[model samples]
Target: GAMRIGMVCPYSFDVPGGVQSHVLQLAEVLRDAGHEVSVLAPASPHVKLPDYVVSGGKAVARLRFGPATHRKVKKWIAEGDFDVLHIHEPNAPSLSMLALQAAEGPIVATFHTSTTKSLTLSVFQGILRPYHEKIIGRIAVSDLARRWQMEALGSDAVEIPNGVDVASFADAPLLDGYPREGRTVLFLGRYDEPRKGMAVLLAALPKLVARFPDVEILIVGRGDEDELREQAGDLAGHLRFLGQVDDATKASAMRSADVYCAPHLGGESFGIVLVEAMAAGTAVVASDLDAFRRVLADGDAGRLVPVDDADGMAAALIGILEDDQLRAGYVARASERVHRYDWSVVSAQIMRVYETVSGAGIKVQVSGA
Candidate 1:
C-alpha cells in the first residue's frame, strides 16, 4: 500500500539542523518502504533529495516567510493535490497555519522541538486550538514535547521518539590520529547556544582533569567554540574540538568515549543525542530536568544529574568510570532501547496512521511515478 504525502517543514537538508534531519530521514524511510512522499519546504537550500518527490514554496532560507512565502504556501495547499499533509514542527509559525486551513486532506503534525518562548507559543495555541479538535492526529519526539503540545491543543499526542540508523553510527571506527587509550568524555551539541551548558562543562573540567589525569574531553559540533575557548583559557589542553563531525564520526566518538554527557538547560524537547550516544554503547549522564525522565526511562537507561552542576556531572561521570559492571549494564539496556527507536519500527507505527486516514477515503496515492 502506497500513500502520497505533502511534507512540510521550516528548513531543508543543507541547513544542518535537527528538524531538517528528521524530515529527510522520515521521507527516506517512508519512500523506501514503498510510498510516495513529496516534500514542501522553503526552496533556498536547493539540496538534492530523492527522485520520487516534489517540493514547492518560495525560494527562501530557513523558510522564514515574508509575504511571498506565506502567499505561495496558501496557493500550494489550496490545490488539494496531496492526500495527507505531514507538517513537521507544528509549533512553527509559518506553514503550520496554512497547512491547518488550506490542505483538503487528513493532516498530521510532529512536535520536534522544545516548549519555549511563551509569547509565540500562546499565539500559536490560540490559532491552532479550534482546528486541533478536528486534526487527524498529532505526534511528538518525546513525552515532554507531547505534554506541552497537549496543553496547547487540549489533547494528548502519540509518542514517537526520533530515529537514527544505529548500525551506521555504531560501526564507524576511530580516526587514525585520535587516541582511544585514555578515557574520553564526549559532549555534542550546538556550542554557541548557552542552553547546551558548555560553561558548566568547562567549569567541571579542571577538577576532572586533576583527578582523572588520563581522561580527555571531545567537544563535537560547531557554534560557540570561540567563546568557549576564551572562557576555558589553559584548560583547553585536555579538550579536543572536532568541529562539525558527520553522523558516522559522531557515532565513532560516542562509541569511543568512556562516558557521554548531555548537560542541557531549557529548550530541549527531547534528548536525541542521549539515545544516539546510548545506541553507540556509551554510558550517558543527562540533566535532571523533568522532561528527560521519559527519554531516560526514569533512569533505567542512563544516569540523570542536576543541570549546571559540574560537580554533579563529574560525580556521575566518575561513578560510571569506576564500576565496569554497572557501565556494562547501562550499555545492554541502551542497546535494547535503540531497537524500539529504529526507523523500520517507527515507519510501521506511522503506517497505522496512514491506514486510518486511508480507510476514511482520504485519497493517499502510493506512487508518484
Candidate 2:
C-alpha cells in the first residue's frame, strides 16, 4: 500500500542544513518509491499572515512558535490526512515540535544531534519528558545520535546513516581555478561554530606550509576570516578563503583536491563530509572521532589523526600528498565503503522503519519504458 507520509523539518528551507537536506532527500526517495510524501519546512517567523505557504519544490508554514504555529500545524495535519508523520529534530523548538504537539497520530522522529552540550537541555531533559512520548518510532543517523536521544529524550532509536549521492560526487569535474599545479588541501563546512574545528586546521597551517611552501589551502563555507588569518600568521598567504559554496562547487573542490582535511575537535555524530570526500575520490585526513572512524572503515579508506592534534594532522596530510600509491589505495577503498551509504541502499532501511510503524509496505512501481 502506498501510504501518505508527512515529513517536517525544524530548520529553514532557505538555508541549507543537515536536517533540512535530510528531510528533502527523504521526501524525494519516498515519492520515487511510489508513496505519497509531503515535506514541510519552516518559514522565517517575521512575516504577515496567510500563515502557511507551500512552494513548488516543497512547503513552508509561517507564524513559527507560540499559539499561531499550532494553528498552522493542526490545519496541515487535518488536510494532509497522512498515515504517519516523520519529524526531524522534534525537540528543537521548530515546526517538528509544533507538528508533534498538534498531530494526533503515529510519528517517527529523527535525532541528528550528537552531544547534549546545549546550555542545559541538560537541566530541562526531565522536564520535557512528556512531549517525547508522542514518538511511535525513532531514528538516529549515527550510534552517537542514538546515545544522545536515549540520554536526553529517554528514547532508543535504530541507527540509519544520512544518505549520500555517491555517483554524482564521484564524477564531479574539478572546479575552475583548482590550481592543479600545486597540492590542494580542502577544508569545508561552517567552521566558525567551534565544534566544527576550523582552529584545529589553522593550528596545522605552519607545518603544512613548511612542507609544501606552494600549498594551496582552500577554505570553503562560512567562518571568521580575519580571526583565521591572524591565527594562520605567516602561513596565511597560502590559504584561499572561498567563503560559502553551492552543492556543485563543494563536490568539485573535493574531487580536485589532493587531500580533504577534517580537523574537528569533538561533538560530531556522523562525518557526512568525510563520506563526501571519500565518495569524491580524494584522500581524506580526519580526526579519529568514532563517527569518522566508522565512515573511514578504521582508516582503511582514509587517514585518521588524533583529535585536536595539529601535528598528527600535518603528518597525515603530508604522507597522503607525498605518496601516489597510498593516496590511490585510499580512493580505491573509499569506492568500496562509500556505496553502503548511497541513497539507493539507505532509503530501503528507512522505508522498512516507515513500514514497521505504519504497518503497510509501500507499493512498488513496475514500469517498462
Candidate 3:
C-alpha cells in the first residue's frame, strides 16, 4: 500500500548543502517506491521549487537562533494528513524541529551534523531532549554521526549510510572540455575554505605539475574564478576553474578524472563526494580523517595521506598517475565496493525503518536491485 510521507529539511531548499541534497534525493527515491512524498522545507526569498515542496518558513545560518510559528507549522502538518513525517537535523531550531513538534503521526529523525567538540551540543540537547522523546525512529549517516547523537541526546540511532545514484555517475558518458591527454587531478569543494583544503591541493599542485607537465587540476565548486586565479598565481595556467557545476557536469568531471583528491582538514562526519567519485570509477587520494578512513576502508579502497600535508598529497597523486596498473586496481576495487552504498540498496534499508515506524503492512519493492 502507498503511504503519504512528509520530509522536513532544516536548511534552505535553495542552498546546495549536503543535508538538503540528501533530503531531496531520499524524497525522490521514496516517491518512486510507490509512496506519496511532500517536502516541508524553508526557502529563501525568490527561490523556486517544485509543486511538491511545502515551504514552512525561511531559514537562517547554522548556529543562529531563528524563530518559527509552531501554530502555522502545526496547521501545515494537519493539512497534509501524512502517515509518517521524517525530519532531518531535528535538534536544530529550524523548520525540522518546529515540524517535529507539530507532526501527528509516527516520526523519524535523521541526524546529519557532527563535530569533534561542540558547545552548542550540550545547550541544544538540554532544550531539545524532551522533544527527542517524540521521535519513533532515528538515523545516523555514519558512525561519527551516530556517536554525536549518543553524546548529545544519550540515545542510540541506527547507522544508515548516505546513498548515491550509482549508475548516474558510473554510467555517465565522458564529455568534452575536460583534459583529453594528460591525467586530470580533480578537487571538488569550496575553493577558499581552509577546512576544505583547497589551498593544500593548490600548494601540492606546484610539485604535481612540476613532476608531470601533462597533468592538470580541475577545481569544481563555488568560488570566484578570478579570485582563484589570483590565488593560483603562476600555477594558474595548469588549473581549470569550472566553478559550481551541475550534477551531470560533476559526474562527467569525475568520470573524466584520473584521480579525485579530498584533503579536508576535519569537521566531516561523512564524505559523500568520496562515494560519488568511487561510484564514478575514479581513483581517489583523500586525507586520513577518521570519517574518510571508514569510507575508504583504511586505504583498502583508496589512498589516504595526512591531513593538510601538501608533500604527502603530491606524492600519493604522483604514485597513482605513474602506475597505470595501480590506478586501475584502485578504480576496480572502488567501483565494486561502492555498490553497498548505492541508493537501491540503502533506500531499501531506509524503507524498512519507515515500514516499522509507520506500521505500513505493505512491502514496497526497490528498483535497480
Candidate 4:
C-alpha cells in the first residue's frame, strides 16, 4: 500500500546526534516499504536529504519566530497533500506547531526530546497545552518518556520503542587488533559528561584495575574530551578514549567489545546505544533507570546497575567479563529481542499508527501485537 507521509524535524543530522539519525533511518525503512515520503525539516548547515524541502535557509535561527515561516510551512503542508504529517522534534520552534495546526489530514507527533525538565515539559503545561491536544495522537519512544509527556500535556502518548535497522547493522566481518588477553569493558559516548556517567566510570577504574589488571575500558563518541582526560587523573592508561568514530566503526567496535557498559544518569528517555549493543550481539551493563529497564526488558536481556553508582557499575562490568557463559546467554537473548526492533516490523507499526489516526483503524490492527 502506497501511503503519502511527511517528516518534520527541527535539528540538523549533519551534526552527530541521535534524533536526526532516527528520522533518516525511519524515512529509509518506510520508503523501502513502499510509502511516498517527503521531509519538511528546518535547513541545516549540512542536511542533504535526497527528497526533502529544507524549509527556510535555517529552520531554527532563533527560539522564537513570527508567523511568516509558519505560514510558509503551513502552505507547503497543505499543498503536499500528505496522508499523515509526522512531526519528529516536537519543540523545535513555533513554526512547526503552526504547520500542524494548518495541516489538513492526520497529524501525529512523536516525542523525541528527552529531558528531566525542560521547555517541552514546562511549556507544555504553561503555553503549548492547547495546541498539543489538537494533535490526533502522539508517540513516545519509552514508557518513561510517555509518562513525562503525559504529566506535562495531560494526555497519554502511545508507546512505540525506537526501531533499529538490523540489516544495516548486520554482523560485519570481524576486525582484528582487540587486546588478546585482558577483559575489555567498552563505553560509547561523547568525550566526557556528567549525565553520561563518564567520571563515575573513571572513578571506578582504579578499583577495577587494582583487582583485575587485565580489565580495559574503551570510551568513544563526541563531547568534552579534555575534561575527561583531566578527570581520569592518574589512572588514565586503564581508560581508552577514541573520541567519536564513524557509524560503521562504532558498530564494529560494539561487535568487538567483550562487554557494553552505559551507566547513564537520569534524563535519558531512550538509549539507542543499548539497542545497538543488543543488535551487535554484545552483553550490556547499563544504568538501572526506568528507560534502560524497559530497554532491557526488566533485566531479561541485559544487566542494570543503579545510576551514578561507581562501585555497582564496576562490579557489573567485572561480572559480565568474568562469566563467559553468562555473557553468551545474554547475547543470545539480546539477539532475539532485536527482531522486535527490526525496521521491517517497526515500519509497518508506524504505518499502522498513521492509519489509526487517519480513521483507517477499522481496516487494520495498527497497534500492539
RMSD of 4: 6.5
Which 10 residues in a row give candidate 1 its minimum summed lDDT?
Answer: 115-124
| Candidate 2 wrong stretches, greater than 4 Å | 44-68, 92-94, 115-156, 190-200, 360-369
Worst 10 residues of 3 by lDDT: 115-124
lDDT of 4 by residue, 329-357 (tens): 99898888878877777677667778766
lDDT of 4 at 115: 21
Model 4: per-residue Cα lDDT at residue 97: 55
Pairs that clash in candidate 2: none
Q: List ranges where model 3 is wrong by over 4 Å.
A: 59-71, 114-156, 177-179, 224-233, 360-369
**For model 1, what is the error of residue 45's alpha carbon versus the real structure, in angstroms, after optimal superposition?**
4.4
Q: Using TM-score as the measure, which candidate wins?
A: 3
What lDDT does each candidate get? 0.67, 0.69, 0.73, 0.67
Error of 2 at 79 (Å): 2.8
| Candidate 1 overall lDDT versus native | 0.67
Q: How many clashing pairs in candidate 2? A: 0
Instruction: Encode model 1's per-residue lDDT on 1-369: one tens digit a residue.
Output: 667777777665556777777778889888888777777766544676666444445442344446666566666655535667777665434455445544444566665544210111111234554655233223233454445555654343465656677776577686664545667889887777879887777778877777687777888988766667778888777778888877778888878787888888755465677768877888888888766766678888899888889899878887787788998898888888778777787777666665555445554222221
lDDT tens digits by residue: candidate 2, 220-305 = 89888887777778777888888898888888888888888988777556478888888998888899988788788898888999
Stretches > 4 Å off in candidate 4: 59-71, 113-157, 173-175, 223-234, 359-369
> Which should have the higher lDDT, number 1 or number 3?
3
